Write a protein that binds this ligand. Structure first.
Ligand code: BCO
Ligand code: BCO
Ligand code: BCO
Ligand code: BCO
Ligand code: FAD
Ligand code: FAD
Ligand code: FAD
Ligand code: FAD
Lengths: 387, 387, 387, 387
């Protein structure tokens, strides 16, 4: 259940229960099979249903069918999706915020009018390309070259860790159009890559430890002709978009660990009351009660932090420090919460028949899949040295 | 510098700024001397000045001279007072909540009219008596007998850990009238004693690790004559006012750890830029940046948690489990933040010349004061065994 | 890559390097295959090769083909095998210790001569059957009962969480022979069960999150006619045999967490010296150096702890508190070190191509295997309450 | 009571028993006056008593007045020290390890007969001086210049945080003779200072937060006069001289927090078995049992590590990395163990009538003093990156 402590007003609490019911009747009985087979056969249908329900494009303005609400609604929807299935949560985050937000913020009129109608309804899949095989944290050191020949850009390089790679029809890929600039950041430029262009291909899916079901593969570029009209933002100014969007991406993806540990508690609490030992329920022992108290306090603290930070950005007060800090704290707490939940189940929590094993593997992604904790602490640290 | 992310009204921000301005001029410079001498000669004058500001009865009705504000503003004032001096913060918390807030919720009209105006204007100091030398956590096992004869109650016994003891003019003392009743909880009765009654003798102050300046002494009752009109709550059913006061005292007291963390951050963050090591400022090292990130994230998470829980209580969504959780989390995080703040200073954090040593000793009280930390875990755990 | 701080003798150092060169060509290159297939195809061949080396009966007397060494050599061999493959290490320990030690400490002159030769030689595999589906930590509440049908014992019930179930040829099973005794412990009795006896069978191998490749199943007893000569210990004396072996299995299995915490460091340190970020190797950053230092200090502390506690048990002074404390501390520290070790690889540590995920999944077992992290603290606390 | 599990021989156990029976009724019964007044009335008498037993020369041979034992006996006797009274615990380490052994290991025959026969016999007090206000972490960036005018060096500058300052008769002061050399390590040179030299003076003693009783003040050098024969080591080659005693310091001072943990355990275990709450002793609750288990496991883990490293050091194998790791882990564990011990006492652990707060304030020294944890982590990182 949930409490009104989060300060959720009208049209926000009803959406929570609606998403809960939808994911419990559709997504909840399928998370196990998704994690087992490492694939999601019902991906297109699920995306169509999400587009019809109006959760896709939640942050997009009301011009092409978006909802036009704040980030808090997106945060709670991401939290509920991660609570239902952690693997689908990363894909939803990459689709709704990693791609759509860059299109609605820096995309021009003709640009967003072409892709968003086919992206909000759930037809196209929105992927993002930043990291590279030789640049995980140092995103500004990318080697993807983009030479200019008239009104066409020829990209020749490779990407890695691309969420929803082979399924994405439109991909926001950052390319370094100028490798001779004095600042390394001034050379990168964002381009809208579309499926079906000559010279574009994708590799096989990666076999990850967790998040099994979210497709991820290597991107290959070989003489790919990118039109000049597909540029995002301005030329040689791609850093002012990537750096400004990565904060919102870390902010929205912070709801992931929230829903993960929420599901952890929702699975742990009834088990501690049903399972009995030493003549009584195991949930009455002081150690189990202390663990429950710690997990509940950590979950509530992280949820309130994320919600209060999301409410600030809805009013126009965005900071790079807080967006990284909230997701760092949420992931670092959700890891320990999942460990304690696996511990509370005992031997039964060690087999893959229970979803407790998936919660730990999924919680580890938010520490390395959305920037490492070291980079987050560095971003927070540099925020104080600038005063 | 506090951020607007906390989600406060403009009047609340103005009140916070006014408190910061008032305490910086009158309490912040002499904060170290109060800890060094364990005495506050200007206690009654500072209490009168606070009464002129209306912060003493900030949760009391306006008809008694109070401000009539909610618990959120009370937590704000607590955090602001604890930001300058932790001992004065604890004293204000024991005065405004344990005595003033208790009478407005369970006292009669005459009992309120007699005591509240002087308590709000700073004329009388309030105190609460729950702990005993033989019963610190198990308050139900108190042995203070309160046998009655006619229209007077004959109290006989001693109580320990009484905050603001020697300086309090009106005290709320919980006593046990019927010790032979089968229900151990249904035998307590709250009495409102005052200075001047024959038999009410206070002991000397107690020298403690922190919170120096708060007068704590042992109360001694030897055949005292308490009139039948100074009864708080109902006769032989004082357990309900005792737990109602206990559930709300942990919420307003959470500002103490918040204020201490704010103080240690406002002392550390500037200090890391006016200190040189290896030819550079110590604030530029990645380990110090990680320490700053951890401290800032913990402070922000605890503050948002406490604020969202306090705002929920203003609309009738009160819960003892949430209050115990927030106070436990705030104390546990403030202890670690105070431990880490000393390491940032290096050697300048292990001497009384810097306030970094005082904030650590004061933060330890919140883990053992107003209920033990393990008792909080037990209370939180027992809240799930009834669902 | 180890250091001489352990204080082991020259003979014990030879066994350390002997297994080092053997496991790195026989067990290490196939660890990923065993993990992904969850089936040790060369299980019996590897067991026979280990029996040729004498590491199976390393704690057995030299009369039955053993080695005659102490518990420290067994602990170091277990640590090395767990470093090579944590899944195979658990099976090796649960066979060697939990069979040979239980047989030599409580078996008569005939039972030792009958089973120990082929058990040490590797032809017979051993296992311990104490846990139940309804009793993991509360082993005294077992439901398996035995009834005397003349000079025979008809065992009825089921056993769960047995390592090497379908592979063990000789199994030690505890069965309650009396239920009318006032103490519940006075009814438990130990029996020797061979493979292929009428009424003995295995249901199916279960799948676990970690320790993949170690065969675990459910034991089913359907009117099993165990002879009276197969009783281990004495009549109605199984708990004294069980608790004696329970204290020794915790010390021997402590090398598992030690092995995993050594392997994560042996795989992490050479990785930070290769990958470069921001123009330099990631190993030169302070945030990585601090984590490496913490992991190394934790590993060394746990290793010295286990090695010093092991030496005390060979002299003739063993305690149940230390045996639980060492395994609890080792499991917790190994889990916390693997958590950082996966993060040190960045995105590469989240895929199955690297054994970091396997090391993490195998580390969680020792917190919920061979006892429970909660019950160990209870056993430790009950030691002080008895003094 | 300590057990033989630590790995001590018969002579070492007898030495531990002698220290336990000698420190009582002489030291410990007066650690509360030393803590309250920050003054040792019979410091010189206690030092003379220690000199009669030979603990001051535990590492020095019998030729000069010591006992001729190894560093294991030193780290053992420094655990009994600071156990009865943590205040005087730092003075013994600064006298024996920092001054006596520094002259024994890196001294000539002439200097090995003028000061050491006085220091080992307790007639003189020794101390080391390397830190300064501008260099507390960057020891190679000193500012104290040393100009040569023949056969006498004139020291000019200032130093801070010198242990045993106002009472040491022999002080080893490090000064830079060549402030123009490019390598900072090539300009440092060690010197021997004796009380009563012209230009040398001691400032006011510092009122530290904890460890009150171990004198510490500021050294002022104004046109000093030290003969050339008092140079320790070689001129312009004090790099290896400085960073050789700093390693044995970390190795030997690691027993400091071990004694603090032993003291808080010897004070916590009996108190939990005499204090009753809710009709039962507080030591029987599962939370207090878990706290005792964690404290005991941490103490046993930190104790075996330091002892094994000392055993390895007594044979030729020395490493600064392990010497820093053992003391940093010991301090980090002792802080939490003191926090838990104060938590187990509740209200009584806060007043100054109990040594709970004293042991907490004493434990914080080893984390910031004698080398911060960041310096040790950086040293371990540099040692790992060199290979
Ligand atoms: C959730 C699923 C999807 C994912 O997980 S993908 C996450 C992307 N992958 C990652 O690895 C995380 C990326 N991490 C980072 O980029 C780093 O944190 C970091 C510190 C920004 C690296 O930047 P640096 O190389 O050190 O250079 P820099 O900080 O000076 O930035 C270069 C230019 O960025 C600009 N910038 C930085 N923060 C900004 C902001 N909040 N808004 C707008 N612009 C911003 C900055 O002005 C600078 O401009 P210029 O170079 O001076 O002209
Ligand atoms: C400067 C000011 C700061 C300070 O220093 S204040 C220091 C005083 N703070 C303390 O925490 C004292 C210690 N507190 C405690 O020990 C806890 O209260 C503790 C552990 C729950 C008491 O233990 P128990 O004996 O088990 O009590 P219990 O569970 O049986 O009591 C339940 C009875 O209370 C009653 N109750 C009424 N309103 C309540 C309410 N709003 N919340 C909780 N309980 C409430 C509840 O109905 C129940 O009644 P009944 O006896 O079963 O009939
Ligand atoms: C690959 C993994 C390998 C594995 O085998 S894993 C399975 C390990 N299973 C576990 O359950 C471990 C955790 N549980 C335990 O340790 C015990 O079950 C537990 C809960 C502490 C025992 O508590 P209780 O059930 O209440 O029984 P209890 O403590 O009163 O003891 C009953 C009898 O045991 C006896 N006992 C205990 N330690 C002993 C020793 N070292 N030597 C001889 N006898 C010992 C004790 O004297 C008592 O005797 P009695 O009742 O007077 O007949
Ligand atoms: C003898 C008493 C010791 C004490 O009491 S001090 C504890 C707290 N007080 C302090 O002043 C700070 C403690 N020390 C430090 O923090 C470290 O020295 C510090 C400054 C972080 C290390 O950074 P750096 O300045 O770069 O110095 P460094 O490590 O590169 O060393 C410079 C030269 O020392 C040498 N060195 C280092 N460890 C050594 C060893 N175990 N044995 C012999 N020589 C050693 C190193 O070879 C180097 O010499 P070279 O110039 O390359 O020839
Ligand atoms: C108005 C007021 C003001 C106060 N001000 C102060 C102050 O400023 N400073 C101060 O120090 N104190 C103060 N106190 C006292 C403080 O409230 C008590 O110290 C606190 O409740 C704990 O009490 P105790 O340590 O005496 O209980 P104890 O029972 O002695 O607690 C000792 C230990 O027993 C443990 N314990 C008890 N029951 C259980 C259980 N069921 N399970 C597990 N563990 C258990 C506790 O966790 C604790 O660790 C004040 C009290 C009141 C009423
Ligand atoms: C013989 C001797 C006796 C001593 N006695 C005592 C004693 O009695 N009591 C005591 O408290 N201490 C003692 N010390 C420790 C020493 O005095 C410490 O330096 C003390 O804490 C004084 O600190 P400081 O502020 O001068 O230097 P520091 O402790 O180093 O403080 C400076 C700050 O700069 C930061 N900094 C510097 N470089 C880096 C970096 N690379 N990365 C991150 N941060 C960095 C620090 O970590 C630290 O926060 C003793 C040392 C010696 C050698
Ligand atoms: C040879 C052998 C091999 C095994 N191998 C494996 C293996 O590979 N993997 C595996 O998962 N299991 C294995 N087991 C089973 C393992 O022993 C149990 O999983 C474990 O002891 C407890 O788990 P449970 O869920 O069965 O017990 P439960 O008692 O159901 O544990 C549930 C939770 O209740 C808690 N609890 C119980 N009593 C108390 C109390 N008094 N106070 C506080 N908390 C309490 C426990 O701490 C635990 O957190 C093996 C057993 C044997 C005998
Ligand atoms: C849309 C998109 C989706 C992605 N999806 C996934 C996914 O689903 N799963 C996944 O695993 N990955 C994913 N990635 C990749 C992921 O974002 C990167 O792996 C992440 O930024 C960390 O990169 P790295 O580990 O490769 O960097 P690395 O350099 O490998 O990091 C290794 C270590 O180096 C440390 N380090 C680097 N710089 C510093 C510094 N200055 N100070 C201290 N330490 C440092 C890091 O902190 C880290 O601990 C995705 C990337 C994008 C762009």
């Amino acid at each position: 259940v949930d409490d009104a402590i989060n300060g959720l007003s009208e049209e926000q609490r009803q959406l929570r229960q609606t998403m809960a019911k939808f994911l419990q009747e559709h997504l909840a009985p399928k998370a196990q099979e998704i994690d087992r087979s490492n694939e999601f056969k019902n991906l297109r249908e699920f995306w169509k249903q999400l587009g019809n329900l109006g959760v896709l494009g939640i942050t997009a303005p009301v011009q092409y069918g978006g909802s036009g609400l704040g980030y808090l609604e997106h945060v709670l929807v991401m939290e509920e999706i991660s609570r239902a299935s952690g693997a689908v949560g990363l894909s939803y985050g990459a689709h709704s915020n990693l791609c759509i937000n860059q299109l609605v913020r820096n995309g021009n009129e003709a640009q967003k009018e072409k892709y968003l109608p086919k992206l909000i309804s759930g037809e196209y899949i929105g992927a993002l390309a930043m990291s590279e095989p030789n640049a995980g944290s140092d995103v500004v050191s990318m080697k993807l070259k983009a030479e200019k020949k008239g009104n066409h850009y020829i990209l020749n390089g490779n990407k890695f860790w691309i969420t929803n790679g082979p399924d994405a029809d439109v991909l926001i890929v950052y390319a370094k159009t100028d490798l001779a600039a004095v600042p390394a950041s001034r050379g990168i430029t964002a381009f809208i890559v579309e499926k079906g262009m000559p010279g574009f291909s994708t590799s096989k899916k990666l076999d990850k430890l967790g998040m099994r079901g979210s497709n991820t593969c290597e991107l290959i570029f070989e003489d790919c002709k990118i039109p000049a009209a597909n540029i995002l933002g301005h030329e040689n100014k791609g850093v002012y978009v990537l750096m400004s969007g990565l904060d919102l991406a870390r902010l929205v993806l912070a709801g992931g660990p929230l829903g993960l540990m929420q599901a952890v508690l929702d699975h742990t609490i009834p088990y501690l009351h049903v399972r009995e030992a030493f003549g009584q329920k195991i949930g009455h022992f002081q150690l189990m009660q202390g663990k429950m108290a710690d997990m509940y306090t950590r979950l509530m603290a992280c949820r309130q932090y994320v919600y209060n930070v999301a409410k600030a950005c809805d009013e126009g007060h965005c900071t790079a420090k807080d967006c990284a800090g909230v997701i760092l704290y949420s992931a670092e707490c959700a890891t320990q919460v999942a460990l304690d939940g696996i511990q509370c189940f005992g031997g039964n929590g060690y087999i893959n028949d229970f979803p407790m094993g998936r919660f730990l593997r999924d919680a580890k992604l938010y520490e390395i899949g959305a920037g490492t904790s070291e980079v987050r602490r560095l971003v927070i640290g540099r925020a104080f040295n600038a005063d």
